[PDB]
Amino acid sequence: EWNDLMRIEGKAKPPKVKGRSQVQPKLVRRQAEWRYSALTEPFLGSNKLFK
């Protein structure tokens, strides 16, 4: 369910109607998108990994 919220699938998907839109902006993906690159970088800041 949490992955479906991230990717807009399953219950998170908007219903389909003939004369109306189905545009859903992605909030959880955005909030995670900054967090990823914030967290990954410290482990790649140097040539050696373990002290």
Partner: protein
């Protein structure tokens, strides 16, 4: 995925030269309109091909 009901559909493309290929686009060598779009169906008749 959910909320699509309970049905899945796929598309199958038949070759060019099968008898199952039935269409309304056909022009013979002269330039006139012909009934069938296949050059020849699943027919191996030498007389029919020529």
């Amino acid at each position: 995925p959910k909320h699509y009901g309970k049905t899945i559909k796929v598309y199958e493309y038949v070759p060019l030269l099968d008898d199952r290929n039935i269409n309304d686009q056909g022009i013979d060598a002269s330039g006139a309109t012909i009934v069938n779009g296949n050059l020849y169906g699943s027919s191996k008749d030498i007389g029919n091909i020529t």
